[PDB]
Design an enzyme around this catalytic site. Structure first.
Site, PDB file in Angstrom:
ATOM      1  N   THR C  29     -58.647-116.218  93.919  1.00  0.00           N
ATOM      2  CA  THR C  29     -58.582-115.119  92.970  1.00  0.00           C
ATOM      3  C   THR C  29     -58.426-115.610  91.530  1.00  0.00           C
ATOM      4  OG1 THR C  29     -57.380-113.093  92.378  1.00  0.00           O
ATOM      5  CG2 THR C  29     -56.092-114.921  93.309  1.00  0.00           C
ATOM      6  N   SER C  30     -58.999-114.860  90.593  1.00  0.00           N
ATOM      7  CA  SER C  30     -58.799-115.130  89.178  1.00  0.00           C
ATOM      8  C   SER C  30     -57.322-114.933  88.822  1.00  0.00           C
ATOM      9  CB  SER C  30     -59.687-114.221  88.327  1.00  0.00           C
ATOM     10  OG  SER C  30     -59.313-114.284  86.963  1.00  0.00           O
ATOM     11  N   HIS C  88     -53.922-122.480  90.724  1.00  0.00           N
ATOM     12  CA  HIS C  88     -53.536-122.384  92.122  1.00  0.00           C
ATOM     13  C   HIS C  88     -53.071-123.756  92.613  1.00  0.00           C
ATOM     14  CE1 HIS C  88     -54.726-118.230  92.751  1.00  0.00           C
ATOM     15  NE2 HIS C  88     -55.897-118.473  92.193  1.00  0.00           N
ATOM     16  N   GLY C  89     -52.287-123.774  93.680  1.00  0.00           N
ATOM     17  CA  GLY C  89     -51.819-125.035  94.220  1.00  0.00           C
ATOM     18  C   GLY C  89     -51.375-124.927  95.664  1.00  0.00           C
ATOM     19  N   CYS C 130     -48.692-122.510  93.110  1.00  0.00           N
ATOM     20  CA  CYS C 130     -48.036-122.380  94.401  1.00  0.00           C
ATOM     21  C   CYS C 130     -47.791-123.757  95.002  1.00  0.00           C
ATOM     22  CB  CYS C 130     -48.862-121.506  95.336  1.00  0.00           C
ATOM     23  SG  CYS C 130     -48.818-119.777  94.790  1.00  0.00           S
TER      24      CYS C 130
END
Lengths: 4, 5, 233, 234, 4
Positions: C29-30, C88-89, C130
């Site tokens: 997701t953006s 993100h992660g 994350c």
């Protein structure tokens, strides 16, 4: 609120 | 800026 | 000898990697609100007298190339180095726009034996991403090591999601910038980050129409291999 | 306000798990020098007014049972909790005398929702154990809180790396931790004490070995803080 | 010196  | 090299 | 020398001619570079939009190869997701973070960080570190470089929507190849190039710069006249990763992660991982790269690979460029003009200087990595997919429900109330002088300031505990607000920015970066603005002229960095932990832990709680994601909490995670106290003044 | 309330009637428990001798079938070596660490820690935390309990050579089953039981005690009159683990390890793992225990399993007993009499109080885990097999060659110079909040994990070494222990003097990290606490516990906040421990380990120690693979190696401890306030021992 |  959203999770990364 | 933003985006600087 | 208790505190890092911070009166070199330059405070140092602040690299901000801001990944908002991701390729369909990953889907993902953006990251609405992340431009708010990136702007907040730019202004915050400008006021701390860092040379800020913002980068947007980098592939994992581009992230590695950027870090490699920066680690090959001459940092002799700089006191410190700061890298902020917004993406993100997963545990131990940050995403380029087209896939994952190991945080270890990024950090390794700046090892004491690989980036000699930063040897003995604080190398700060600030990570909004994350670190897994757990949710916190909360509860009612003559040589130095090559791995020395790193600090990894994580937004969230290992194994957990990290929270971002689409309007206000991420909880962690909101709090980090606020605490730096209020205390960078008064407190040592670990004590600032401890205030950030308190702010995130106490002043934020998720609101969601999905019960599974509602009323959740977050605690950031400071990982220090610093050998001295760090003052921004 | 910015600091944990440390004037409860008791500072709290300091549990020391001292694993020296391992079951033959595990193939794990005896940890010469660890008794020096355990005695040093006992005296150090005694001077900080902790109720110290030393345990030696616990199986993986006994470690889990000990931690479960301690987490079920009433800590209402205690300011904090400290657990020191002295053993073999690998990343995320401490060894009982007969096999591994997940550090996450140990920590979970003390989560804010599972140990309610420690909620909001600092829970400190001090870990002397390997975290892998890498060697550092060095370089010449209304409200809720998170259930994971108010933990600190003070690791002897960086993730992925061996941790060093001297058979005569004790481990580099515990030697340094006790010395800095003795010197600075009446003067410095805990994170600043641990930063001095980082510097001492990083600068004053280097391995000596007849084996070139293991000779002239270095170590940096790794502080992991999810604390929400400053911690003072005075 | 020995490793743990």
């Amino acid at each position: 609120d959203e999770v990364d | 800026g933003v985006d600087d090299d | 000898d208790n505190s890092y020398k911070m009166d070199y001619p330059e405070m140092g570079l602040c690299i901000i990697i801001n990944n908002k939009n991701f390729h369909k190869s990953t889907g993902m997701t953006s990251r609405s609100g992340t431009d708010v973070d990136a702007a907040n960080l730019r202004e915050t570190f400008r006021n701390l007298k860092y040379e800020v470089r913002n980068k947007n929507d980098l592939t994992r190849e581009e992230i590695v190339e950027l870090m490699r190039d920066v680690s090959k710069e001459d940092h002799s006249k700089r006191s410190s180095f700061v890298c902020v990763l917004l993406s993100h992660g997963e545990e131990g991982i940050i995403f380029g726009t087209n896939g994952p790269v190991d945080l270890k690979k990024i950090g390794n460029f700046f090892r004491g034996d690989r980036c000699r003009s930063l040897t003995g200087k604080p190398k700060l990595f600030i990570i909004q991403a994350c670190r897994g997919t757990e949710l916190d429900c909360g509860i009612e109330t003559h040589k130095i090591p090559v791995e020395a002088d790193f600090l990894y300031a994580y937004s969230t505990a290992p194994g957990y999601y990290s929270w971002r607000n689409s309007k206000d920015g991420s909880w962690f970066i909101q709090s980090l910038c606020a605490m730096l603005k209020q205390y960078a002229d008064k407190l040592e960095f670990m004590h600032i980050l401890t205030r950030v932990n308190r702010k995130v832990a106490t002043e934020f709680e998720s609101f969601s129409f999905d019960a599974t994601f509602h009323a959740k909490k977050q605690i950031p995670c400071i990982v220090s291999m610093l050998t001295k106290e760090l003052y921004f003044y």
